[PDB]
Structures are given as structure tokens and as C-alpha cells.
Point group: D2
Chain length 144, copies 4
């Protein structure tokens, strides 16, 4: 609502998960990953209060936490999608680039790349499809 | 700008004072008032960092602090513009209404009224024209 | 939507009437008026097609049409609300100000003034409350 | 800007070319292509007036015109970037997908792919870097 919504990158399996709020700021990402992306969880701010979205996806893999500093925000996201074992098409890797540093890559960068550089705007939330892994991924952006 | 900008209410004396960037949350207002509005100062959040705008205007009158709680936000602003002494058109009064309570009125409700009820959106910042008193006033809003 | 929605100015009688489209351009206003505002109708554009909203209100008074030229857009709206005979609070007058000329005032400028100068943004649609007359009025804005 | 601006895909050579203001509707694309993308030109609407952006880029290749019907809009863009001749990273191919049909691919789909599926929003304009070819490419999006 007032946000541009990009997606989906990835396949059709899993179950859709999406936000119900009105995010103004992305404060933290928790990503689980191994040979692909296992799960996503993120916190966002609405009317001065923090909300937790997720966890979406399974408890496999290893956990990594991205917690943005004051004045730090994402300027790009990259990743790859493709098959893993019996799953036809899922999210194999993700990389998050802020104005201060790069986080990742998480997962293995097999399959078809995608990339979202942001020239004017802010990334404030995510959605996707999830089962035991991240089947598909999308992004919410606010104009700057 | 990604923000809708309303204004100006008032005259054309004084310094045009404005913010840069794209505030996403208004946290605090400090207002000085007596027979008119003397000064405005407000804190806002951008990219997780708090900034202080102002003080804009002089040190006349009496000071009042409005501090918004998490989950509290403005739903309307009212005011009046008119003459005071030798200044033909400045800001005589302001009232701030949140979802929780009403703050004010501040100043004296003499002159021409104005009113900005918000049915969908968030007030995140202000601008105006300022000398010894508040000569003109405006509002920044983002979609909700 | 990604629109800021301002309102309501006026009273609580009549029926709320609104849009749910995705307007990107206000093309035309048809207004009926006499001692107050009798009715409102407007057209907007979405994906290069024109859509008619309204008519909201009664068939009294006389009709005027405001059709904007290419390159012409509203920079302000003014009006007044107040009693008309036995009605406590309805829309008594409206004035539409574009970057090229002023349309109105329509009705009689009795009652409490309101005014919406737009410093950055575009007015793309309206809503309100309506019976035989225009009981209340509001405005949709997109950022510029 | 009230528009989300994505980019740049491609390299750092050539000269930046961009629009001003806030387009609200994309009406036409003319693209020149052969081994890569040679040039881009597009028509857009702002405040009810149609403007021409470009042509940006060179005179080589062959020309194709995409004329959007009323009710037709882009739902996705895909492309590829990579080296060619004296240029280390430029735009090798572009594909434009509307709600009615697919236009392209133009150029040669050699190099690193990118893809922008729009789940909620409208593509209204483009920008990039240009010399005799299209060195880099970006996209303006409006909330829907």
C-alpha cells in the first residue's frame, strides 16, 4: 500500500506467505541457508513499533543475522534461482548489499541470477513462498 | 519527493526552513506559543536514525512538549493564520490531534482557520517560514 | 493505496461515496451548486482509460464543468462548510485553483473556511458524503 | 522522487540520460538493436500531456516500435548485460512483457541475465547510460 511489490523469483511449490502490516523501515533479517535458502525472518517498524515477520521456511541450514545500523539501508539485493534435488525451482542464494557493506552470499550461487539495484527508494519488507525451504522470493519498496 | 507536501498556510516573511530526505516517523514536537506561535522543533526518524529539526523561530512565549508513544500518530492538524502587530499574516494558533488525544490549542485562535484531517496517511514532518515567530506552516505526509 | 487521503470536511449526514480504482490523473469535474454544493462528479485516468465516478448528490442547482488542459493540474482547493437552513454542517462552497486559472467559487462562501495548498503532489480524485446535497468532502493526492 | 527508481543494470561508460518530473503512463517504446541494444526512445504522459524521451544511443541496428493500447501495461522486463567490442559491460538484450503480449527479445541474450517481475506497480519510464550503444539501463515504477 504505497509500496512497489516485485516478484516472484523462484518456483510454484510451498505456501504463500506475506505481510499484513504497513512497513516503513527494515531493521533486521535472519536468514537460514545451506545449499539453498532454508528460511527468512525479518523485523520492520510501523508507527514507532517493531513487528516480527516470519519465520517463513524450515529450520535446516545455518543461521545468519543482518542487523542494520542507524543510517544503514539496502541499496541492492542479488540472488539465484533453480532446482535443488527433487524441487524443480527454488531460491538457491541471496546477497544483501547496504550502503555500508555486503552480507552474503548465502546459499550456493547455482542457477539463474537475478539482481535488484535501487537508485531511488528503500527496501522495507519481503514476501515469498515457503515450505521446508524458500521456494520463491519478493520485495517491497517505498519511494524516496 | 515520495512525500506529499502541503502548504504554505500563512505569509511570506521569514526564512524558509525545510528538511531534506524522506522522514518516515514523527517522534516529538516542541512548540512555543503565547499570542501566536513563536517556534517549532521536531524530531523525526529516517533510516533508523533520529534527527532534530529546528528550533525554527524565536524564544518568546511558553514551551510545550508533545511526545508520541509507539502506536500513536497524528490524525489531524488545525490552526489559524492572521495579523499580529506589524506582521500581516503569520501563524496565530496550532492544534495537534492524534489517534489517542488532542494537544492544544496553542496560541490564540484569531484569524482565518485551516484544518487538515487525514483519512489515510501519516504526518511525518513539517516545514514553514520563520523569523521571531512562525510566519508560515506546512506538512509532509506519506501514504499508509 | 499509494495515495494520501484527506478528509472529511463537513458534517456527518448523507451517505459516504468513494472510489476504489487506481487514479493517476484527474481529467474533469462536474459540480452542481446554488446556495451550497448540490453534487459532484469526476473522471480520472487509469492505464490510459478514462473512468467516470459519481454523480454523487442531488440534481438541484446549476451545473459547471472543469476540464483540465494538457499540462494543467490543481495546485490548491479552498472551500467553506457550515449550516444551510436545517442542515447543521454541509459543504457551502468550493474553489479549484490550477496552475493556469481559478474555477469558482461555487456556492456561497458562508461558514468555516478550509484550504489545501499543494506544494509537492497531485490531486487525482475525490470522495465525500452525499444526500440531496454535498454533506462532506475529501481529496486524494499522489506524491510528485 | 515519488517513483521507485531501479538501476543501473550494465556498465559505467557512456553518458547518463534521464527524465525530469513524474511520468504516470508509458505509451510507446522504440528500440534499436542488433548484437546489443543500440538505442532507446519512449513516449510518456505527465499531467495529461505526452512527451518524448530520447532517442538516446546510436543509429545502428534495426528499429522496432512497441505501441501500448489503452489498458495495456508492462508486467515484467528481462534482459542481459555483458561485454561487446570496446565496451566492458553494456546492455546486450531486453524483453518487454505486457499484460497482452511479449515484445522481444531484442539484441542477443548473451551474458548475465536480469529480470523484473512486477507484482504490484506500474512501469512508467526508463533512464540509463548511452554512447553509440546502451551502456546501462534503469526503470521508474509507480505504486499501483
Amino acid at each position: 500500500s504505497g509500496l512497489v511489490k516485485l516478484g516472484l523469483w523462484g518456483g510454484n511449490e510451498g505456501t504463500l506467505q506475506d505481510i499484513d502490516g504497513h512497513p516503513t523501515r527494515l531493521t533486521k533479517i535472519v536468514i537460514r541457508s545451506a545449499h539453498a535458502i532454508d528460511a527468512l525472518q525479518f523485523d520492520y517498524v510501523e508507527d514507532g513499533k517493531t513487528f516480527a515477520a516470519g519465520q517463513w521456511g524450515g529450520n535446516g541450514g545455518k543461521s545468519d543475522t543482518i542487523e542494520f545500523q542507524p543510517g544503514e539501508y539496502l541499496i541492492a539485493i542479488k540472488g539465484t534461482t533453480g532446482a535443488l534435488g527433487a524441487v524443480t525451482n527454488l531460491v538457491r542464494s541471496l546477497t544483501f548489499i547496504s550502503n555500508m557493506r555486503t552480507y552474503g552470499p548465502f546459499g550456493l550461487e547455482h542457477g539463474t541470477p537475478f539482481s535488484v539495484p535501487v537508485a531511488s527508494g528503500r527496501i522495507v519488507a519481503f514476501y515469498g513462498r515457503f515450505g521446508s525451504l524458500v521456494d520463491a522470493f519478493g520485495i517491497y519498496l517505498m519511494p524516496y
